[PDB]
Design a protein around this ligand. Structure first.
Ligand code: CYC
Ligand code: CYC
Ligand code: BEF
Ligand code: MG
Ligand code: MG
Ligand code: MG
Ligand code: MG
Lengths: 302, 301
C-alpha cells in the first residue's frame, strides 16, 4: 500500500532516480514518487496532488528553488511547507534563505545516504505537523481570550454571541455555526447564525421543530461525522438534509443549571470527523457563554 | 547575538576541539562550550548546566550512545548523535530514543553542524511551546469552569493562585487585595519552601496611598528578572530582599475600571526571565478574576 506521497523536483533525471532508489531502502514507509524537472511543473503537481513531502532542487532551469518556495502556497488547514531543499550547488547562506522561505531541512547532494534521506523526510513531515499543532493552539487561545475580554468589558450579550459564532466558524473553517436558544415553551429558535455558501441559511428560513434534553442538561455533546451513518431517526435525517447539513456538532449552553440553548456547528460540503481540539474549544466557549449569561441577568436585576 | 550553551561528549580530545572550532565559526550565536570525555561526566554536566544542545559521540569508553540516551531524565532532548560512517543503523535507533538529529563523523562540515544544532534547538523549542500551551489552556479552562459553577471569590482565587504556581513552577504566588485607602494586604498565598511565607508576616507597605495605584489601574505590569539589576529604588529592593524575592511578576486585578488588587509571582531561588507566554497567562487570569469579582459584587446587591 501507499503510506506517503513524495514530490521530487530536479532538472537531473539521474538524481531523481537516485532518491527514488534510496527511498525504497526505507522499511517504515512505501513512497509514491512524483517527478518534475522544471519548477513550474513542480508547482502544478504540488497544487494538484498534494504530496506529503517535497524534495526541491535549488538550481532549476525556469526558476531557482528559492523562487519556488515563495510561490508555493500552503493549504489553510496545514500552512507549513514539508519541503526539503537538496542541492549540489548550495551554501549555508542559501540554506539559511531556504529555511527562512519555509523549507524544513537542507541537504547537500554528495553526502546523502538512504538513511539520512529517510530521517530528513520524517523530520520534515513531523515538523510541519508540530508547527500546525502549535498554530492552532495559538488561534484557539486567541478566540477564547477574546470572549473573556468582552465579558469582562460587560459588552451586550448578542455582541458576545455574534463574536463567538463568527470567530469559531473561521477557526473551524466550517460551513455554518449558529446559536439555538430555547424558550419557556421548550420551543427553540435560531437566534444567531454565521454561514458560508455551502449551506442554506436558516436564520430566516425556519419553522419550529420540537424534541427530552436529559443529555444536554448533563452537558453531553453530539458529534456526528456523517448524518447517514450516525443511526439517526430518518425524520431527524430528513430535517438535517433539508438544510444540506452533512456533519453535525452540537454543544449545550448551560445558564445556571437550566438548559439555555445549543451551540451548533455544521459541515454542508462533506462529512467531517470532529477532532478533540475542536470539541474542547466549543465546550469551553459554551461554558463562557454560560458565564456571560449569568452576568447579564445579575446586571439586569441590579 | 544570543548566547548558547553546548555540551560536547566525546572521548577524543581532538574531535572535541574540532567541533569547538566549528561552533565558533557560527556568528549568529555565541557558544559556551562544555566538554566531557566520559558518558558519566556527560550525564553529570547535563544535569548541572542544562545545555541548549548536546553533541553525543556514539562510542564512549563507559557507554554507547544509546545506553546514554536511556540514562537521561528530563521534556525533550536536544541531542545530536555523532556516529561513524557505516553505522547508520545506530542513527535510526537514536532518533527513536530521543535524539533530534545525527551526523556522520567523517562528513562533518561546519555548515552542516550549524544546521543540526539550529534544527535540534528549533524542534525542541517547538515541542516545549506546544506542551506549555496545552498546560496553559488547562489552567485557563479550570478557572473558567469554577467561575461558571460558583461565585465564591476566595475559592476561585485559591484555585487560581495554586494553579499558576504549579504551571510556572514558581516559588511563590499571592493575591494582594487593596483597602479603600489603598493600603494593601496579602489575602491569599501559595508558596514552597524556597520562599519564606509572607501570609501572616506582611510588612505593611504604604507606597500606594499617595499614588492610589493609578499606573497599575491602567494596566501596568511589572516583570523583573533580577531585583538587584532592575534599577529599583533602594528601599524597594531591600523590602523584596527581606523576603528573599529575587524575580518579580506583578499583574493588576481590576474590578470594573477600578484597581482591586495585584496578582504577584515571585522567584526566590534564582533570577527568572518572565516569558511573554507566561505574562500573557497571568494577564488572562487577572481578567478572569475581574469577571469573578464582578459577579460576586453584583451577587451581594
Ligand atoms: C435551523 C435549524 C433547525 C434545527 C436544526 C432544528 C431542529 C432540531 N432538531 C433537533 C433534534 C431532533 N429533532 C428530532 C426529530 C424531529 N424533528 C422534526 O422536525 C421532526 C418532527 C422530528 C421527528 C420526530 C429529533 C429526533 C432530534 C434529535 C433528538 C436527540 O436525540 O437529541 C435538533 C438538535 C440536534 C441537531 O441539531 O441535530 C435541532 C436543533 N430546528 C431548526 O429550525
Ligand atoms: C510580602 C510581600 C510584600 C510586598 C511585596 C509588599 C509591598 C509592596 N510594595 C510594592 C511596591 C512598592 N513599594 C515601594 C516603596 C516602598 N515599599 C516600602 O516598604 C517602602 C517603605 C517603600 C520605600 C519608600 C515602591 C516605590 C513600590 C512601587 C513598585 C512599582 O513602582 O512597581 C508592591 C507592589 C509592586 C511590587 O511588588 O514590586 C508591593 C506588593 N508588602 C508585602 O508584605
Ligand atoms: F542543480 Be541543484 F542546485 F543541485
Ligand atoms: Mg539542478
Ligand atoms: Mg568515541
Ligand atoms: Mg540534517
Ligand atoms: Mg529538525
Amino acid at each position: 500500500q501507499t503510506s506517503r506521497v513524495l514530490l521530487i523536483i530536479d532538472d537531473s533525471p539521474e538524481d531523481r532516480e537516485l532518491y527514488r532508489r534510496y527511498l525504497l531502502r526505507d522499511r517504515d514507509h512505501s513512497y509514491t514518487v512524483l517527478e518534475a524537472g522544471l519548477g513550474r511543473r513542480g508547482l502544478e503537481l504540488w497544487q494538484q496532488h498534494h504530496p506529503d513531502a517535497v524534495l526541491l532542487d535549488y538550481r532549476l532551469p525556469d526558476l531557482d528553488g528559492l523562487e519556488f518556495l515563495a510561490k508555493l502556497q500552503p493549504p489553510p488547514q496545514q500552512p507549513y511547507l514539508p519541503v526539503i531543499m537538496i542541492t549540489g550547488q548550495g551554501n549555508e547562506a542559501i540554506a539559511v534563505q531556504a529555511m527562512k522561505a519555509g523549507a524544513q531541512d537542507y541537504l547537500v547532494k554528495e553526502q546523502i545516504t538512504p538513511e539520512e534521506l529517510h530521517l530528513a523526510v520524517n523530520g520534515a513531515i513531523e515538523t510541519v505537523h508540530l508547527r500546525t499543532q502549535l498554530h492552532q493552539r495559538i488561534e484557539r487561545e486567541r478566540v477564547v481570550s477574546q470572549i473573556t475580554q468582552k465579558i469582562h468589558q460587560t459588552l451586550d450579550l448578542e455582541e458576545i454571541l455574534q463574536t463567538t459564532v463568527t470567530e469559531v466558524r473561521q477557526f473551524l473553517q466550517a460551513d455554518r455555526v449558529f446559536v439555538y436558544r430555547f424558550q419557556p415553551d421548550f420551543s427553540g429558535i435560531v437566534v444567531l447564525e454565521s454561514v458560508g455558501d455551502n449551506c442554506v441559511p436558516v436564520i430566516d428560513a425556519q419553522v419550529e421543530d420540537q424534541y427530552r434534553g436529559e443529555d444536554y442538561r448533563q452537558g453531553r455533546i453530539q458529534a456526528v461525522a456523517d448524518i447517514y451513518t450516525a443511526g439517526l431517526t430518518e425524520c431527524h435525517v430528513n430535517l438535517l438534509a433539508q438544510f444540506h447539513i452533512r456533519a453535525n456538532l452540537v454543544v449545550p449552553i448551560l445558564h445556571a443549571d437550566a438548559l439555555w440553548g445549543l451551540l451548533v456547528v455544521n459541515q454542508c460540503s462533506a462529512p467531517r470527523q470532529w477532532q478533540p481540539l475542536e470539541i474542547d474549544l466549543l465546550k469551553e466557549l459554551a461554558t463562557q457563554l454560560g458565564i456571560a449569561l449569568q452576568q447579564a441577568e445579575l446586571y439586569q436585576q441590579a
